Nucleic acid binder design. Sequence first.
RNA 1: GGCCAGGUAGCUCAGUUGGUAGAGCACUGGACUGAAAAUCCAGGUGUCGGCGGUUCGAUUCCGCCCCUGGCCAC
Length: 367
Amino acid sequence: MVGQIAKEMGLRAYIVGGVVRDILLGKEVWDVDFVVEGNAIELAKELARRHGVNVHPFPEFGTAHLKIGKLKLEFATARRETEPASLKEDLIRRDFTINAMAISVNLEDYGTLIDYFGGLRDLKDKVIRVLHPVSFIEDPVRILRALRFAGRLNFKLSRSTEKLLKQAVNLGLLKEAPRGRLINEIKLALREDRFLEILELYRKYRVLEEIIEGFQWNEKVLQKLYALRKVVDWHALEFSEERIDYGWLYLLILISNLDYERGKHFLEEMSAPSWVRETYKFMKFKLGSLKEELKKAKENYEVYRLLKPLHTSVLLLLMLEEELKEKIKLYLEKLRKVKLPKEKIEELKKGKELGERIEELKREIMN
RNA sequence: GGCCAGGUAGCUCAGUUGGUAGAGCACUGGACUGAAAAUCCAGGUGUCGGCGGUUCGAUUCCGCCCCUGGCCAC
Ligand SMILES: Nc1ncnc2c1ncn2[C@@H]1O[C@H](COP(=O)(O)OP(=O)(O)OP(=O)(O)O)[C@@H](O)[C@H]1O
């Protein structure tokens, strides 16, 4: 219906950005980005009116947001910078060639993909390529983004883009960049399933040393990341109904050797979840003694008492130890699963004494 | 859209090793009164946001959503 309203208004609208990429990658998303030559606001208002839904105009930015069903629509006016601006000027201000393309929703040319910079070629060649040599200088945040994309799509940086990125990092532009944008970029990074690869790229180009103060790479941490990779794989395989956010675990492994002050500060900047902060504060201190207690474990009930109050993340961190692995697993798929019939429990009930008695019965069943 | 709080009676507010809930003023009834108020005895003062899951048992553990306020990414 967009092309029709655009025809009535005598305008030109286009699907633009990653939305196109995902479309070309076969990935269907509910968030669509539009670039409109002429006023996008009235277009969004009319489209919202015909479908009979609310509209959220933003005149100063020149963009408008409206929601139809599960579809989240954003209409943006064509702008050459971050006289009417052409679509090409609006695309050339973007980061990478794969994100620089567009698909015309105009009724006459409808279905046609508009690619000026050959982003389609780079898409088929699995290449992350910047539009201009000053790209990383303009927006240092992109230094992360590229890597992030290279993590997700499993693409490779072109020689040009790679050299330019390395030069950009060597100038320490990553420190001059706004803290919030970088932190948010890392937040977007850790949400990826391929995030580990993004960490490999972060290690390769050493951006984490720039962003995080006091952070240095070693082998133990990396091996811990791959072990955690295996644990995450298994847990997301069998226990998948119990899934939690995995990236934060890797993030904890990275900051494990860091000082508690810098760790708490970083987690504060990242706006980490409560269970993440708890797992970190537990890891930095009580984790060692916990392991030492798990080493002295003989009966299964002691293992129960030491494990059950803990979260799943802590257990996954306990699976990093080879000796504790099968123990944790045994606690998972067997130990904590059990029940009791009616008459028996009725005999058990005859305050806290009922609970203590139940515990005595459980440790009576286990051992 | 991300996060942090806040959600407790009509209103204003505390509450952690899960184990049988609270304050200050409105609410009902009776004693009291010509009527009313005060006051006394008392006692509602509540599925402690909503829906699932774990647990013998969840205001608490978790997950998904509702509401309000504040930091922002926009
Ligand atoms: N710092 C930047 N510089 C230039 N162009 C950018 C920048 N950030 C975003 N863009 C462009 O604007 C679009 C905004 O899309 P969005 O913010 O959703 O990111 P994305 O690439 O779609 O990934 P995701 O959907 O995971 O956020 C992107 O497709 C990108 O082409």
